[PDB]
Assembly symmetry: C2
């Protein structure tokens, strides 16, 4: 076991690209955060396997990106749920942090 | 596939916390809980393997465990715990959390 992470207590930016940080990994799920400066992006991708992910916008605003660069607005508190095999990406409009939970883990 | 703006049209109930199913599949169950300040998701556990995570989307609270032990849960805090470890949530301010359970019970 049991533990907490204050994910907005101190965020880490990188001006050249997004920052990826492992929050948790077990047999049950993998939890990772992505911290973006405004305009940065986690490019659209997928892993050709079973399971789903959810992407929760913790801070800032952005877009959930998919197949053909199609976008869903991702305001703070928005959650995207998708199969891991479905192309997904994230684009930050403002400085932004998201949490990704993947189950089962890749 | 599908997105939910969980801080849009937030629903509170004066008498009890509001639980809303976000997503359910074989992989995980995703549920939101919306609390007025002072409301609580009572400490609970199920004797089965798996874990849950609780993400604070808005407001501030406390993650609650065995013996009423607390861990501050500011906005953006994430609790990860076994499903079998006693876990609850207490809202200090009006609060909304997202809970992901894997595998779902």
């Amino acid at each position: 076991h049991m533990k907490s992470h204050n994910l907005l207590e101190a965020v880490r930016f990188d001006d050249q690209r997004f920052v990826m940080e492992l929050v948790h990994e077990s047999e049950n799920f993998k939890i990772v955060s992505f911290t973006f400066k405004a305009g940065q992006e986690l490019p659209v991708h997928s892993h050709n396997i079973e399971g789903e992910l959810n992407i929760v916008v913790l801070e800032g605003e952005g877009e959930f990106v998919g197949d053909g660069d199609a976008v869903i607005p991702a305001p703070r508190g928005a959650v995207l749920v998708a199969p891991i095999s479905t192309p997904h990406g994230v684009r930050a409009v403002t400085d932004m942090k998201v949490l990704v939970t993947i189950a089962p883990p890749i």
